[PDB]
Amino acid sequence: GPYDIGDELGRGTQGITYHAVERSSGDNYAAKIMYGRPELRPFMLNELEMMNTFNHKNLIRPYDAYDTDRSVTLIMELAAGGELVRDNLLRRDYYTERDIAHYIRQTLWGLEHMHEMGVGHMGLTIKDLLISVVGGDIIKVSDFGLSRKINRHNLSTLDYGMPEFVSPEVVNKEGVNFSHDMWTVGLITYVLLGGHNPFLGIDDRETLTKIREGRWDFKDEIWTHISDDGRDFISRLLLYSPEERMDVKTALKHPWFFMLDRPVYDHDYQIGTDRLRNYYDHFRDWYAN
Numbered sequence: 001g002p003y004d005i006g007d008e009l010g011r012g013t014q015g016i017t018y019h020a021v022e023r024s025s026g027d028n029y030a031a032k033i034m035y036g037r038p039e040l041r042p043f044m045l046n047e048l049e050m051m052n053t054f055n056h057k058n059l060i061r062p063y064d065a066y067d068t069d070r071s072v073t074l075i076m077e078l079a080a081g082g083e084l085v086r087d088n089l090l091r092r093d094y095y096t097e098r099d100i101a102h103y104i105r106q107t108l109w110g111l112e113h114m115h116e117m118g119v120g121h122m123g124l125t126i127k128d129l130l131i132s133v134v135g136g137d138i139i140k141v142s143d144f145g146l147s148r149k150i151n152r153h154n155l156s157t158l159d160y161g162m163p164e165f166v167s168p169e170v171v172n173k174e175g176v177n178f179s180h181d182m183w184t185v186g187l188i189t190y191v192l193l194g195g196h197n198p199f200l201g202i203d204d205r206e207t208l209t210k211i212r213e214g215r216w217d218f219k220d221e222i223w224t225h226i227s228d229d230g231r232d233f234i235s236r237l238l239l240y241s242p243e244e245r246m247d248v249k250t251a252l253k254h255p256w257f258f259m260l261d262r263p264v265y266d267h268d269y270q271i272g273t274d275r276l277r278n279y280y281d282h283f284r285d286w287y288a289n
Contacts, residue, residue, distance in 0.1 A: 002064070003075060005031055010083060010127070011287050013162070014043050014145050020075060029063055032074045043145040044072040050119065050144035051076065058110035060130070060142045079140045081131030085280050088131050089192075094270040097230055098259055100192045103129060105257050106139035107185065112248045114147070115178050122146040122158055122176070124184040125165045126191055126283065150178055163204040163211075164197050164283065168240055171212040179242035182251065186237025193230060194222050195275025198238075200282075214240035225269045229256040 006019040009030060020031035032047075034040050051062035051074075064075035081088060084103060089095055107129060114121060123146035132138040146160055155175025158166075167183040169176055191197050198216035201207040216238060218231060233256040236246045246254065 003029070003031060005033075012127070012143060012145075013160075013287070014040050014047070019078070028078050028080065029075050030078045032076065034071045034073070036070055038070060041072055044074060046147065047144045048072075048074055050147045053117065053119070054113060056110055056113040058106045058139050058141055059113060060140045077140070079130030079132050079142070081134050081136050083127055084129040084131055084139065085126050085192075085276065086284070090273055090277050090280060092273060094272055096264075096268040096271060097193060097226055098264060098268055100189065101230070101257055101260055102137060103139050103192070104185065104189050105252070105260065107141060107188075108248055108252050110139070110141040111181055111185070112252065115181070115248050118149050118151075119147055120150045120176070120178050121181050121184075122148060123161055123165075124181060124188065125162050126188055126280070127287075129188070150176075152177060162286070163207045164200060164286075166208070166211060167242070168212055168214050169242055171208050177242055178247065179245045182237050182245045182248065183239075183242070185251070186234050186245075189230075190216075190234050190238065191279060192276070193226055193234075193271070194218075194220055195271075195273075195277075196220065196279050197283075200279075222271065222275070225271075227256070227259075229254070229258070232256070 002023055004021040004023055006021065008016055008018055010017045015032050015034040018031045018033065020029045022029060034044050048062060048065055051060065060079065061077040062074070063077065066073055111121060121144065123143055128141060128143045130140040130142055132140050146158070155177055157173055158170050158176040158180065161170060165184055165187055167180045169180060199207055199210040201210050223231065233254050239245050
């Protein structure tokens with residue numbers, strides 16, 4: 001057998017991802033092993049097909065696949081720096097708004113590659129942003145189990161997802177467009193900068209009712225230290241009406257990213273990691289259960 005399966009690296013709704021070594025080379029890969037429920041097989045096959053459709057620096061690449069009667073294993077590119085939040089931001093005492101803009105721009109470049117070929121990601125959460133090398137700053141977007149071709153003139157419902165990162169149109173059982181991904185980018189950006197999810201309820205049902213209602217604000221003190229452009233970027237994505245949201249190419253033109261064209265000086269505001277760490281502990285526990 002070509003792969004030596006080692007320690008658990010992450011887990012999601014379809015299975016657990018492990019470190020894998022290709023024996024014949026010594027090269028390191030990620031091995032996603034499906035939970036033993038046969039209804040997950042279509043999602044594994046969809047992820048394999050989608051990974052083989054993309055070819056972009058900011059999207060995880062496929063490598064190999066095999067199966068038993070019950071379960072599918074996918075061997076894929078290893079993001080050796082781990083998850084952005086768990087393994088990079090939360091290993092620091094502070095990060096900056098400029099750091100986050102750098103990560104989100106790359107996330108948008110990955111999404112843009114998908115949207116250009118008519119595919120929506122459909123399931124983006126904070127755990128799906130990865131870093132390619134230890135200590136690095138290159139983003140890899142992952143988890144294409146829910147990704148699909150979107151016909152903008154013949155929309156369909158999206159019946160699955162993590163409740164803290166779905167959009168109002170998902171909760172309301174309406175057709176889902178490319179603008180759903182853009183809502184989730186605004187939500188991820190809000191979480192990365194302010195360290196909390198503005199729709200979090202006491203349980204999943206209440207979270208969903210808060211998303212259905214669609215109201216949120218910048219009340220926490222941290223937001224007074226985020227730039228006008230950063231708040232404007234979020235506010236042009238977290239809009240109840242899907243057609244009002246920025247599409248991916250408009251988002252890439254937003255003035256928020258102009259700061260990445262200048263250098264990093266000694267005056268960037270330093271954001272502490274405590275809030276994000278508290279939200280991440282909650283988020284991670286959702287996948288333990």
